[PDB]
TrEMBL record:
GO molecular function, one term: sucrose-phosphate synthase activity
Entry-linked InterPro entries: Glyco_trans_1, Glycosyltransferase_grp1
Binding positions (UDP-alpha-D-glucose): 14, 22, 280, 285, 339, 341, 361, 363-365, 369
UniProt source species: Leishmania major
Occurrences of domain Glycosyl transferase family (ranges): 272-423
Gene3D superfamilies reported in the protein's UniProt record: Glycogen Phosphorylase B
SUPFAM superfamilies: UDP-Glycosyltransferase/glycogen phosphorylase (SSF53756)
One Pfam family this sequence matches: Glycos_transf_1
Identification of the protein by name: Sucrose-phosphate synthase-like protein
Class of the enzyme per the UniProt entry, highest EC level: transferase
Length: 456
């Protein structure tokens, strides 16, 4: 099977004078990945108001625009005129169709796969290009979509008759254009997580659930890698605490003076070792099992910093913050809420071990993301981690009651710090993540899925 992929990105790649979105830095990693595969050429196109298509290579082109790239939530997509939008999309359409003829003439062969990067406009374009490719007697080429999210929260506010999100597009991609109302336009769709798999499935239900999948699991080794010369302070010293709106800093005992909203941690270099959690504040992450376990080790007078990354509903955020400080006496355990992935790579890079004691973690990307920067991982014998965590990169605790897990986590962090798993396993954690869950393997799994699940 020989692949001639044309991929339509939604954001700008990393470059001179431009950092990348998330969906952009990915398109880029994927572009390299797919091209590195035997029997595979992928051509990408993707917009910027800074960067210019290259002169010394043809694998990609830039869609040069004067304004910043639109957004779904600086330029908003509803904020621009109707005439602004139509053009922005019909200009892009012409660039893509030129590019495609360039490619198809180049290779003496028809493109046999279209990627399109959010659920908005990029699919409509490729879907329109495809109708016309049939107008001339040349097969339409199967089109797969990446549902990262941003364009669906747009569709949800339109439906939720939210403020700045009047109803313009949702009933258009649906009633007027008919993109996800059958397999006649979009052959398949990849979500990153079952949250997104459902967010989409409710929105476009005449789209077969059999044709909405989860991307084969990888991590983005461009982002997640051993970050050179990172410090404690460089990586998270200037990260302000989170907690919750209404956090009464005044009930904190004295020893807990260190805790306070929108206030960085004092004296990062003062703590002997660092221990990291990262994940949505779901109940099954068993955040509570960590704090329980950190409560037992802060009293051991070894200076163990404990960081609690991730985002949570103001109810559940208040739950664990108050469980941590009021209920357990946690003075060396700060909540810094959610963080970008690159900031997180800096954090992992300087962390001694990470603990993600999820019950039935479906796959757990934070496990391999953290390994991809050279630090070991501790988790539980349930779910996705049973298949790739081993004694060489960390540990999985025997499953049990939350209090049971927490005692076992405590046992784990204590051994990991004491045997310096960072030094003794950090090397293999890195070479292991990069080998088995690089964008290169995820690309290979993905094209392979697409062949047998989306070629009707
Ligand atoms: O503060 C955070 C926490 C998580 N993530 C990302 O969220 C994704 C999902 O991991 P999580 O544990 O939140 O949930 P999952 O879908 O793995 O159950 C991973 O790509 C993480 O790097 C992130 O970008 N920032
Ligand atoms: Ca989307």
């Amino acid at each position: 099977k020989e692949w001639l992929i044309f991929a339509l990105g939604t954001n700008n790649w990393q470059g001179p004078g431009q950092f990348a979105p998330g969906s952009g830095i990915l398109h880029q990693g994927q572009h390299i990945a797919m091209n590195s595969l035997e029997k595979c050429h992928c051509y990408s196109i993707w917009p910027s108001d800074l960067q210019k298509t290259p002169t010394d290579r043809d694998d990609y082109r830039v869609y040069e625009i004067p304004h910043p790239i639109p957004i779904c939530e600086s330029k908003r997509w509803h904020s621009m005129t109707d005439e602004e939008v139509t053009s922005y999309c019909d200009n892009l359409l012409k660039e893509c169709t030129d590019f495609i003829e360039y490619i198809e003439k180049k290779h003496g062969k028809r493109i046999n796969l279209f990627l399109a990067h959010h659920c908005f406009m990029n699919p409509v374009i490729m879907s329109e290009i495809n109708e016309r490719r049939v107008a001339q007697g040349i097969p339409k080429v199967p089109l797969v979509v990446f549902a990262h999210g941003t364009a669906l929260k747009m569709y949800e506010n339109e439906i939720n008759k939210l403020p700045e999100f009047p109803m313009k597009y949702y009933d258009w991609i649906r009633g007027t254009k008919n993109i996800f109302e059958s397999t006649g336009h979009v052959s398949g769709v990849f979500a990153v997580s079952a949250p997104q798999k459902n967010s989409f499935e409710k929105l476009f239900p005449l789209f077969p659930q059999e044709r909405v999948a989860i991307t084969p699991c990888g991590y983005n080794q461009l982002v997640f890698h051993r970050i050179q010369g990172m410090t404690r302070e460089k990586a998270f010293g200037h990260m302000p605490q989170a907690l919750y709106d209404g956090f009464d800093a005044t009930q904190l005992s004295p020893v807990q003076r260190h805790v306070a909203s929108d206030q960085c941690i004092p004296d990062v270099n003062a703590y002997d070792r660092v221990v990291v959690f990262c994940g949505r504040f779901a109940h099954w992450k068993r955040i509570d099992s960590v704090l329980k376990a950190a409560s037992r080790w802060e009293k051991e007078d070894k200076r163990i910093l404990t960081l609690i990354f991730g985002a949570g509903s103001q109810e559940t955020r208040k739950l664990y913050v108050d469980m941590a400080y009021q209920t357990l006496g946690l003075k060396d355990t700060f909540f810094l809420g959610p963080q970008s992935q690159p900031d997180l790579a800096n954090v992992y890079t300087v962390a001694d071990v990470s603990v993600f004691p999820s019950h039935d973690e479906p796959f757990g990307l934070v496990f391999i993301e953290c390994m991809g920067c050279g630090t070991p991982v501790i988790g539980a014998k349930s779910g996705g981690p049973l298949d790739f965590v081993n004694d060489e990169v960390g540990a999985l605790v025997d499953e049990g009651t939350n209090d049971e897990v927490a005692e076992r986590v405590y046992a784990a962090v204590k051994q990991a710090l004491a045997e310096d798993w960072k030094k003794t396993k950090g090397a293999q954690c890195e070479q292991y993540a990069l080998k088995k869950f690089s964008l290169a393997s995820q690309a290979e799994l993905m094209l392979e899925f697409v062949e047998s699940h989306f070629t009707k």
